[PDB]
């Protein structure tokens, strides 16, 4: 009797709004341009599945179309906020060691999880053995870098799809976005780009968790009286 | 009960179908969010193929009209001894200052190329700019 | 009257620079490993320059320096490879320190 009203006022209400968390105010095409997000790899490194998201090549250097990045980033942040609102486990994954420390701190500060180390075989596909039969796996995996250190796709991309876990991923011009649920074409190498991404996801996640508490508290106060 | 066939459809299609068949008792936490706000492309595995014969990538080289002026300026006067400051988003190099003057004089009706280039150098010298010809 | 991306790109200093070979740019040292200076100069990738023998102690974190660029990204395609191998760093020659 009271559960249907709970799930309808709290879990189903955010899903009826196009931007329930107002994540569009977090970034702009100018803010992305100043962070050098449009800078891609050389044309010789281009992945053919990244051609849709490329604006062009400036002297053999690919430029990422930030008009698309903004639309993809809106979807990626919106999804991430909704999963944080629903109390989902968000796992950040990246093998770029220049940013391992930064990413681990961003995860701890937002109350989420980070895996920036050597990804061991079967962490996702064999989790019950490695952690225990009652281990809960992540509900959302966010890739700040989708490639490993040998320039191949991070094993967790395939393993996330195997386990039916949606993935958010920054995909540079040399990356493969086919299996990434919410790809975001953008520069993953420049420190300014990576720092920006961490602020956006950290802020989106932190806002969504605070929104969940506000709604719950109001729903309880109104329930008693 | 589930499906690890990551190359068969997408996580949504495999989850939606197994939910219909009754194999999955409960929908995953993300299913309702994906349904309401789906991605632009459904994430379906694809194999990148290599182009052969007369197949070429559609990416186009980015060029501007002023790039012709920049190539000539670098040829005639070389790169300025002034250093580029790519951190300042409003930085103007000697070449950009040359290009802006070259564009202004073109809008004044001048159409010759060799004449429009010599008058621009004089204007900058009058303004105090150092233009040391390479040769 | 919101500026478009095509507008930002046309008027960007990196776009206005043209080719990067033999271009003088100002970099900033952000990381140092022994005598290896990691310098960002506004591009996608940093460059790594060895500490000069003269006035080596003047090069510290935050020091702004003058560079002569060679390539924004060092990449090459080797025989039997479908893509290009990249080392994820730019090629630049350290000239000295920038002072006012």
């Amino acid at each position: 009797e009271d559960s249907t009203d709970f799930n309808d006022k709290i879990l189903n209400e955010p899903l009826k709004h196009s931007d329930f968390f107002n994540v569009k105010e977090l970034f702009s095409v100018r803010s992305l341009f100043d962070a050098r997000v449009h800078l891609g790899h050389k044309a010789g490194c281009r992945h053919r599945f990244m051609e849709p998201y490329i604006f062009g090549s400036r002297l053999d250097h690919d430029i990422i179309d930030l008009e698309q990045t903004a639309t993809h980033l809106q979807l990626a942040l919106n999804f991430t906020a909704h999963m944080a609102y629903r109390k989902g486990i968000i796992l950040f994954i990246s093998r770029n060691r220049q940013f391992s420390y930064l990413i681990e701190n961003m995860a701890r500060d937002c109350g989420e999880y980070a895996h920036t180390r050597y990804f061991r075989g079967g962490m996702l596909t064999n989790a019950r053995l490695l952690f225990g039969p009652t281990v809960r796996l992540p509900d959302l995996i966010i890739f700040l870098h989708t490639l490993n250190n040998i320039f191949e796709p991070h094993v967790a991309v395939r393993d996330a799809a195997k386990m039916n876990i949606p993935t958010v991923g920054i995909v540079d011009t040399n990356c493969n976005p086919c299996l990434i649920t919410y790809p975001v074409p953008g520069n993953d190498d420049s420190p300014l780009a990576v720092h920006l991404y961490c602020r956006l996801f950290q802020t989106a996640i932190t806002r969504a968790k605070e929104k969940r508490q506000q709604v719950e508290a109001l729903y309880r106060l109104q329930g008693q009286k | 009960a589930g499906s690890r066939l990551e190359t068969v459809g997408s996580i949504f299609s495999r989850t939606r179908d197994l939910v219909r068949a009754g194999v999955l008792k409960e929908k995953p936490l993300w299913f309702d969010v994906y349904d309401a706000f789906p991605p632009l492309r459904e994430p379906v595995f694809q194999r990148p193929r290599v182009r052969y014969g007369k197949a070429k990538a559609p990416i186009q080289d980015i060029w501007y009209h002023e790039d012709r002026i920049r190539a000539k300026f670098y040829s005639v006067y070389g790169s300025g001894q002034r250093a580029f400051d790519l951190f300042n988003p409003n930085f103007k190099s000697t070449c950009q200052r040359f290009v802006e003057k070259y564009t202004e004089l073109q809008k004044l009706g001048e159409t010759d190329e060799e004449k429009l280039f010599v008058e621009t150098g004089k204007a900058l010298l009058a303004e105090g700019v150092i233009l040391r010809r390479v040769g | 009257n919101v500026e478009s991306f095509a507008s930002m790109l046309r008027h960007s200093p990196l776009t206005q620079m043209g080719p990067a070979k033999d271009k003088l740019v100002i970099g900033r040292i952000f990381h140092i490993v022994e005598n290896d200076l990691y310098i960002d100069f506004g591009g996608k990738f940093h460059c790594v320059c060895r500490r000069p023998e003269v006035d080596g102690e003047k090069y510290q974190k935050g020091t702004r320096v003058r560079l002569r660029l060679l390539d924004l990204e060092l990449t090459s395609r080797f025989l039997g490879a479908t893509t290009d191998t990249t080392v994820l760093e730019a090629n630049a020659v350290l000239l000295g320190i920038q002072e006012s």
Binding site: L59 | Q60, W63, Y64, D67, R68, R70, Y74 | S4, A6
Partner: peptide, 26 residues
Amino acid sequence: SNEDLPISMENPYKEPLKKCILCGKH
């Protein structure tokens, strides 16, 4: 449409091809 869009043309910064010491000589 838009004035700031890229325009199609040939590389203006392209450098000449290399030449041997005897290129152009009988």
